[PDB]
Design a protein around this ligand. Sequence first.
Ligand SMILES: NC(=O)C1=CN([C@@H]2O[C@H](COP(=O)(O)OP(=O)(O)OC[C@H]3O[C@@H](n4cnc5c(N)ncnc54)[C@H](O)[C@@H]3O)[C@@H](O)[C@H]2O)C=CC1
Ligand SMILES: Cc1cc2nc3c(=O)[nH]c(=O)nc-3n(C[C@H](O)[C@H](O)[C@H](O)COP(=O)(O)O)c2cc1C
Ligand code: SF4
Ligand code: SF4
Ligand code: SF4
Ligand code: FES
Ligand code: FES
Lengths: 442, 156, 227, 72
Amino acid sequence: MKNIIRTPETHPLTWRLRDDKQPVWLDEYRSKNGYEGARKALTGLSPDEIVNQVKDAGLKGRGGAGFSTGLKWSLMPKDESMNIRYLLCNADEMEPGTYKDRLLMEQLPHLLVEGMLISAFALKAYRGYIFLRGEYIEAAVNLRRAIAEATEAGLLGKNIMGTGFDFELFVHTGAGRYICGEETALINSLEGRRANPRSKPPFPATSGAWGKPTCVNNVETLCNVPAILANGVEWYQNISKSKDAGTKLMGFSGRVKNPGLWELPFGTTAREILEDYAGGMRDGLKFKAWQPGGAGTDFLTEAHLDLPMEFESIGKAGSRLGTALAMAVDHEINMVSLVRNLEEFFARESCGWCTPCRDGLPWSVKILRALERGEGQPGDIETLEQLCRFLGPGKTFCAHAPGAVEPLQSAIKYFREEFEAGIKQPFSNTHLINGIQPNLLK
Amino acid sequence: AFELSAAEREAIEHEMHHYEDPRAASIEALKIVQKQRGWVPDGAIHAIADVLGIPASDVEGVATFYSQIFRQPVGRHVIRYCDSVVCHINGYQGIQAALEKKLNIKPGQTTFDGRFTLLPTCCLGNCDKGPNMMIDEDTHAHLTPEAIPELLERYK
Amino acid sequence: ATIHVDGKEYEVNGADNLLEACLSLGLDIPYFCWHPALGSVGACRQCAVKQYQNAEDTRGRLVMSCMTPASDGTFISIDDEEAKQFRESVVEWLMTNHPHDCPVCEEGGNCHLQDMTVMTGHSFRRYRFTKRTHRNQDLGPFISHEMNRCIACYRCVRYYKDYAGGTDLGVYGAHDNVYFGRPEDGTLESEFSGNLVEICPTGVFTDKTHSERYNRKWDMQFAPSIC
Amino acid sequence: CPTTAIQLTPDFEMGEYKRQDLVYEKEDLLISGPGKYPEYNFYRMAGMAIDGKDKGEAENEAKPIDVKSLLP
Ligand SMILES: NC(=O)C1=CN([C@@H]2O[C@H](COP(=O)(O)OP(=O)(O)OC[C@H]3O[C@@H](n4cnc5c(N)ncnc54)[C@H](O)[C@@H]3O)[C@@H](O)[C@H]2O)C=CC1
Ligand SMILES: Cc1cc2nc3c(=O)[nH]c(=O)nc-3n(C[C@H](O)[C@H](O)[C@H](O)COP(=O)(O)O)c2cc1C
Ligand code: SF4
Ligand code: SF4
Ligand code: SF4
Ligand code: FES
Ligand code: FES
């Protein structure tokens, strides 16, 4: 579908993009209704009024989990003695299959700057950090230039717009770990420590970065904020007739005709995304599987392609919506090799804190290597299944290992024939010792 | 054996100004030393620790936790080819085989000339244009195995 | 506070966590990363029990007893089959990379890892692949270092750094190649480094002075004395 | 015995004149061969390094990956 008319009413995030894929700087951004929501927020709205406005707009988190943003902002302490607060932008985006934040920050940096400004004013957060991955050189350059332009234009720094709100925005480039995207591990990596996640409670809203109240939000959530405050609650609730309010960046990748990213309302079915926007599979390819929201989501089949891309609709199907960036797997891809690659990523991106991930993902990796080489033995599939069952939520310290075992569980559930075809050798981990008769178990 | 230059120390202190705690500039200090010297040598750990006022074991734990902070010497150009699932579907194995045939090295090793270091990196966040490669600061997408012996020849 | 463990009623301190409250009652829950003097961090995932919402609940949920408060009216099960299977699985995951070292290990007969391996009932190996190995460091004349035996329970760094205030011991690395030691070879600088031989549940940090003239714990003649 | 070092052998002629001579030291016990278990070597299985066997050279052992290595 080339005929995409990106009006600001239906495409609040991508209507001011440019055809040559060039970044929109401060003059062009303010020409196309820039910092209107920030002006309204900082000249005619209380911070609690903004928090309640975002809560009434129903803005959920765009970083995969779908937690409500207004409820997260309302969990900040009501003490007036805690005024050293921090806002963090999770620009890490280390999940395989996820490329939305790169587009948003390379081409519209001032949208992120305005969203950080509005969210910091709502949270009464004196300081803001953009935790960005180190592989995004152009996004870092564009964000630093946008921050410099907003600072010289009076939109950042001391006494913004004459209200008296002081806000300083920094860009922190990471050093390449997938676990750094997890918000408590993100806080640990921001503090100059090893990025081990933290147990919750306490949540970062009460004790976050350097012990202060801290709110971590994804890039796309903070890009959703300025349109909410520039158009209103009823406009954000009246663009989609679904329980998930607002629009979402969705797109199919991998052996499709037009891989890319498009802004679509919630409740859009995955089949029409794949057929109209992605163009379907390429020539001589048969669609066999797909992942809805990145490497940490369960595989779904052709029958699940008709489901709307919502949190609850895909949650009921045995998966989760995730980042809503789907990946298509054709019939030429062996599922054992694909899950082997996924589990190698998840095993080597472990942080090493807790036993089941650290010592059970490598066992699953070695089993999958054996099944890919055809050297599988009986009990390997049962071992994979009990690794899936014992790496679920609550068994491990953070959510990295449940997201690791979701593709393994789904692929064993659907494409079990390949995993059973990997097994060719009899089971043996004990060799013969010359003078000792073995205990011949049955 | 190691001594921080004046520009390195000034950049490290400037990064220390941006945080509540001077410990929070450890990753930036390691990246500054790596940018100036190609990698982080052994004396640099104690130098960074002495500047930041944190123990050298904390600096070493940070430097060995993060894969982009190099702790062994590397080549002049670090090839970082993507390894994740979407580039697996788009065929990164042909790219890896082409790189290993052209450079005659396994991943994680350096050529005898000291020109290239081959590394399998994580997902580069460019999955719709896969397979992806990242030489020192440049991302190259839409890779084909026949374009490698031309792509590698403009990094002298 | 009142807790119900396996249908039996106990009166505990509500400011305690469930692991220390149940160990004070004489109940046996396996654990590695918890120490009474160091607090709870929930790393090793060994102390799992099954917590129920109320008395008339049967499904329950596996919780870490070291990270769970012993609040009033709590319902847990230690001998639940799911909890026992998970604890045995944690021991098995630790056993996958552990070296075949007990006869030539100074910790043998005095090893918390041996005790918890036997306590969970894990005695059958089905892992068939390779074991990760590590180089050792020279930690000085008092502490001998054997990094193969590590189960990554983080007790050494928590004691030495957070408790004792030492600066030259740390954790380095990542996913399953975590290394606990000094940044380089040299003598451990803390005046309280010798407590690592009892803090470490395995034989990584061992009494080198004892190791020169080693004998097992059952062969010792002990007495209570004053330093 | 976890190394198959100590073994009971088919031999019964052990009478003595003095009871003190029934205390056998190591030079009275150490034979010049493997006995009833001809091939088992405990040290080929143990992870502890000795002469002729470095770290990673035991059975079912991978080579030690240095913490400073470049591979993730
Ligand atoms: N690149 C990406 O966008 C990636 C996204 N994910 C997604 O992230 C999720 C897992 O991450 P988590 O942070 O562990 O998820 P989570 O569900 O534990 O929490 C997500 C957010 O909700 C907040 N929250 C939840 N319950 C709360 C409570 N009771 N009180 C206060 N705040 C509360 C947390 O502070 C956090 O900001 C999954 O849904 C996964 O799909 C995972 C990997 C990569
Ligand atoms: C292993 C792991 C990796 C994650 N990586 C990211 C990430 O790269 N970017 C991101 O925005 N959230 C990531 N998250 C989710 C965060 O924990 C957190 O929910 C999010 O950053 C902010 O929530 P929000 O969607 O309400 O804004 C990750 C979570 C886990 C468990
Ligand atoms: S599951 Fe455990 S070891 Fe794995 S990344 Fe999370 S805390 Fe770290
Ligand atoms: S640390 Fe314990 S289990 Fe490991 S070799 Fe020594 S005695 Fe055996
Ligand atoms: S060295 Fe000992 S105390 Fe430290 S993490 Fe390893 S097993 Fe635990
Ligand atoms: S999977 Fe290779 S760029 Fe994302
Ligand atoms: S003792 Fe509770 S998880 Fe380690």
